[PDB]
Amino acid sequence: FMVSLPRMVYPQPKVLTPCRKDVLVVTPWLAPIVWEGTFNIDILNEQFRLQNTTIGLTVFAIKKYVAFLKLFLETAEKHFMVGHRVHYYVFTDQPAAVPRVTLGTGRQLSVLEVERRFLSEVDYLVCVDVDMEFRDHVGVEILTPLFGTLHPSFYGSSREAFTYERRPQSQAYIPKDEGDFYYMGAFFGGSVQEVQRLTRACHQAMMVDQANGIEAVWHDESHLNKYLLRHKPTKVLSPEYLWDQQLLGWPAVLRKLRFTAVP
Ligand SMILES: OC[C@H]1O[C@@H](O)[C@H](O)[C@@H](O)[C@H]1O
Ligand SMILES: [Cl-]
Ligand SMILES: [Hg+2]
Ligand SMILES: [Hg+2]
Ligand SMILES: [Hg+2]
Ligand SMILES: [Hg+2]
Ligand SMILES: [Hg+2]
Ligand SMILES: [Hg+2]
């Protein structure tokens, strides 16, 4: 059950005036592709806050990567789901090495040394790499049952150029005449149920490959792409959400650089 939104004053959407004329804002299966200018964050914030939405952000920090946690968490505090309930889950082999980062109210961090917990603790799960930093708003506009993010190096490439696993012997195999987009494995998520379905599917597919003596060209990412090809995401995030400015600069098509790689 969802309560009614309160009175709100904002610019009237214009039916005869497209959001963007330079990019695709909706997929062929009617899933929005999230770009700056396509959403009114005030309306979305209201919708998700009225549902007391809790977002879980999971990251794995092993070995040398624990060094990226401080910047990752500090910037997440400034740009990730601000105003909403957030629960960080840091999976690490060095619990004592996790930095003591100051969190805003309604935000929590759990250290898990290296389930049902997720189903009872959060509504959505967002899975990202730790060697990154938030530079701009990353909010509820990304929440949906299942989402993938366009890889910054292939958003303008033809499917033939996509680095999908091309060997039929692999469970992640995708032929040259198939494929919608090339999603990057560094940023995906959705409802806890959908994320667990995806991780379960990929885990089993990888085991099958292992038994067959084969390893997907881009490992987990190859399997992620096969899954999202067969189970269309309900939202697709634009490269604004996964960028590398030193490697790719700042093209006009990107009005904002929200989550980027750390040099
Ligand atoms: O072609 C796929 C590869 O693209 C690279 O730019 C990226 O650093 C790799 O992690 C992998 O995603
Ligand atoms: Cl994950
Ligand atoms: Hg618009
Ligand atoms: Hg995850
Ligand atoms: Hg993760
Ligand atoms: Hg998969
Ligand atoms: Hg996997
Ligand atoms: Hg996967």
Ligand 1 site, residue 163, Cβ cutoff 6 A: yes
List residues in the chain that are followed by a break over 2.5 Å (C to N).
Answer: 114
Structure determined via: X-ray
| Separation of alpha carbons 67 and 188, rounded Å | 22
Q: Which of 211, 234, 228, 237 is nearest to 172 (CA)?
A: 228
167 in Cβ contact with 99 (< 8 Å): no
Which residue's CA is the closest to the ligand 1 atom numbered 2?
163
Residue nearest to atom 6 of ligand 1 (CA): 153
Residue 131 beta carbon below 6 angstroms from any ligand 1 atom: no
Give the ligand with the smallest distance to the CA of 255: 3
**What positions carry a catalytic annotation?**
221
Give every strand in the sheet of 107-113, ordered side by side.
33-34, 235-237, 146-149, 187-191, 124-128, 54-61, 85-92, 107-113
User: Cβ(12)–Cβ(40) under 8 Å?
Assistant: no
Integer Cα distance of 130 and 204 in angstroms = 25
Domains of the chain by start residue, with CATH: 1-263 (3.90.550.10)
Whose C-alpha lies nearest to ligand 1, atom 4? 153
How many Cβ atoms are within 10 Å of 177's Cβ, its own excluded? 7
Residue 66's identity, in one-letter code, is V
Resolution in A: 1.5
244 CB within 6 A, ligand 1? no
